[model samples]
Target: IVGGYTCGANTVPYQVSLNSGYHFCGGSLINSQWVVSAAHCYKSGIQVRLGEDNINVVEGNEQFISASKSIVHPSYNSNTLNNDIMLIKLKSAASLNSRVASISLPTSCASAGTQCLISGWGNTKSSGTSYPDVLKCLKAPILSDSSCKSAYPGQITSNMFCAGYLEGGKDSCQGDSGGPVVCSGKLQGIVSWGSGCAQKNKPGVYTKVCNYVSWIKQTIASN
Candidate 1:
């Protein structure tokens, strides 16, 4: 139900509370000790909650983890968005349960062409303000490397990936910047960029989760 369709204020949303009370967009738990979010999602001070959907209306258990260290892929360039991925090392590992959960990382068996789920608390329609406590999601196909190469023009570096229909009208928006794009219960990507919120022909881009598995494993192991 999280990624079956486009986001609208009417549905549930994730609440991103940043330092100085500045808010942004983000998504789910990836490891007991790591949270899968976008590079841009990282801020000097901030916290995220995923168990609840309605940020304004619903109540969620706050998993307070001071980011001891933040790891953004070395290749990330906000200018071109080559590698828009990052992870937060929570001061403590999250508690596991049905309400508080962790999503699986992708295995080598992953590939292009499969539809993936992109979820966030971003705006549904392109626009002025973002959806505060509501969560929205949509289905996106894993783009073919050739098609993505032709469409984005150097967009899919080894660390990046492509999703959504080229024609637009459904994508991650301002608030949904750094989030998770999952498929088969495995995290396939992290929401990075698009021409506009749901703009047609300009599919959303994400950090390829599989490509970072080694780093992820190492970080998890060390932590």
Candidate 2:
């Protein structure tokens, strides 16, 4: 869900904040030492924030760690937003607990029109500059590739998928990139890009996680 409401602090515990001095993008903790985020979110001084709901305040459960390495997909295309995914290695392993845990990645691709969940600390409205202090959750239904292609024309590739409302309202805005799209209780997508926030016929687009499962596994294994 892109334009939802504030969620419980412990809900969606895998959601992590990728901060490069400031909040750059969202990410998901796949393991104690690895985080999965969007490739386009890359920037200098990148750090990971876990187990925190409020960005303005440092809670007792919060864990901040510097990133040792960030691996963008070899085939990522910024122009077309193709393969817009990345893996980040933390300087130190995360301590797993009730408030901090990793998410399960998808073993298979998601079907069209599947209802999914998304959360972030991005802007509440499109074109708005203000970001939320607390994390927000939204419910979005995955649209088919053909429908997405129709909306985005040649912009959308097989590496990407779409979700959100057709009418308007409810979407992942500008600062929500690299956030998780949980489907059927598994990590299915990563917030990639969109035309605008909650625009008609322009749902939020995301990196298809299942498409890169092999790459993710291989990369994690090797590194």
Candidate 3:
């Protein structure tokens, strides 16, 4: 994330790196065998790396697990990026520890102006290639739906919410899709899309996770 700092060791225990051979997106560990990420990130080969800090360096604490199945929301629209949430079932359950655990999903909506934390291993700049291996984090304030609609004007939907700033500077960028945007120790959103990285009047858009709590629970229960 731009204008942010590296997360403290094990601070974001539920954050995960979605990778093929290299990192492409970020996700959240929702349970021992499942992850919540963006539907846009669904691809052939994705490995979920939990307990990760630096992707380039070898850290014995990491748990690299293959994805056995991925279920994207049936209503997901690539053009509008609506209903971008997805669930991934790991090959096996993760071994929980101090550095690896699941994050609780939000049970209620996060109101406007509520301070939240967005974490990822994405670009540190809005332009050019500057992907950091270390996990980065920034505190973003949720914006009201009215404010979000004003910024995008008809682009905002009930399935999504906007966080970060109209003033710019700090936001999740490319390669951060599907990452967690959390508040009050709950997974509130998933990094989805934005007009641009940290652009003024163009804040980052996130999947409103609270809208899918029932779906999440049902999916996990039945599968």
Q: Evaluated with lDDT, which candidate comes out highest?
A: 3
Arrange candidates by lDDT, descending: 3, 2, 1
Residues 99-189, candidate 3: write the lDDT tens digits.
Answer: 9999999889988999999999888998777988789999999998888889898788899999999899888999888999998889999
> In model 3, where do residues sit more than 4 Å from their true spots?
none
Q: What are the Cα lDDT values of the candidates?
A: 0.66, 0.89, 0.92
State candidate 3's TM-score: 0.98
Writing each residue's lDDT as its tens digit, candidate 1 over 1-223 gives 1223545542322222332253475755776667767777767665655455565654655444556677777766877776677777667776665556777888863577788777766666665554546566778788776766776786568777778777666677777777778788788887777666656566777778888888878866775
- Each candidate structure's TM-score, on Cα atoms with residue i matched to residue i, is 0.83, 0.97, 0.98
Clashing pairs in 2: 1-118, 1-138, 1-139
Candidate 1, after superposition: displacement of residue 50 in Å?
3.7
Worst 10 residues of 3 by lDDT: 126-135
Candidate 1 local accuracy as lDDT? Answer: 0.66
For model 1, the superposed segments whose C-alpha errors exceed 4 Å read 1-22, 58-62, 127-132
lDDT of 2: 0.89
Candidate 1 Cα deviation (angstroms), residue 45: 1.1
Best by TM-score: 3
Give the alpha carbon lDDT tens digit for every residue of 71-189 in model 2: 99999988888999999999999999988899999999889889899998888886566688888899888998888989999798888899888788889886789989999988999
